[PDB]
Design a protein around this ligand. Sequence first.
Ligand SMILES: CCC[C@H](NC(=O)c1cc(Cn2ccnc2)cc(-c2cn(CC)nc2C(F)(F)F)c1)C(=O)N1CCc2sccc2C1
Length: 302
Amino acid sequence: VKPNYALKFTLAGHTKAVSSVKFSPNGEWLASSSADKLIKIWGAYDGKFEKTISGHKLGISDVAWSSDSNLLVSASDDKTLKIWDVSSGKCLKTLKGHSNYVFCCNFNPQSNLIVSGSFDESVRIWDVKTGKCLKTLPAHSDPVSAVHFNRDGSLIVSSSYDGLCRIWDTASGQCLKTLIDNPPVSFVKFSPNGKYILAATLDNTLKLWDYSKGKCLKTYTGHKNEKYCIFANFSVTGGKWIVSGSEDNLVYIWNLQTKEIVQKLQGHTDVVISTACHPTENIIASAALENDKTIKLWKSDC
Ligand SMILES: CCC[C@H](NC(=O)c1cc(Cn2ccnc2)cc(-c2cn(CC)nc2C(F)(F)F)c1)C(=O)N1CCc2sccc2C1
């Protein structure tokens, strides 16, 4: 079985490169962030523009949803994160403490915490309610490319240009494990079940790691990734795929177990910096850099 993603919508409105797209947990919405300093909200199923959320003074690298789909957090070159009320568009909190661009962010499952990664080489854990930094982890020796909580929020995985992936105990901030050749690690995230870590390196390679055993299980290649921190995903709604953007302007889809490329989605006219997989339907969102500036929604039968 191969999927058969086809283009459903192209979403225009950002005036600079799109940095990140993410589906709301409830499936209703896509949020997009951009170098244009804006967040935009779009209907997941009809592609309809809903609203613009503004307030950052510089570009945004990443955005993430709370579990109840009511809040967003954004990470900005203004050295802050902001927590947003999606319905009102209002900034509830500005999270201050990083000493350089904030690059990546995520809520925990409970959504009482946010984790952030920065060019300042640190990972910070923030209290959503107070907006105060709870912990600063001296996580890496170069910019942090990704941060992600596991299924229950007990662990954080981080990645860096330093060539390391590290796993952190949330409660204590202590490092439990380093996975260490050491090309820049450009992306990491836990599998939905929390057992595996998907890691991108800037040698055109994605790898699936068993967290428990610290061993590489699968390698995915054929795409182009030597420059940018490109988001990758587990697609679990139909077939079990790996989905990534690519610097050849394509969305790549692999069979997770066999590692074969099963589909390449053509249409973007710049680097596909971000992909996201819908929580319940076989829908991918993709987004591209400044020669394109659009988001595409794609749908598959499997
Ligand atoms: C080649 C240019 C530098 C590069 N850039 C991205 O790699 C990159 C990547 C992304 C996507 N992203 C964001 C968080 N995780 C992934 C976004 C944006 C983005 C930010 N802004 C402004 C606020 N605007 C943009 C957008 F995309 F809109 F042009 C840049 C970078 O940071 N690297 C180099 C590779 C590695 S490997 C470990 C660490 C690093 C650091």
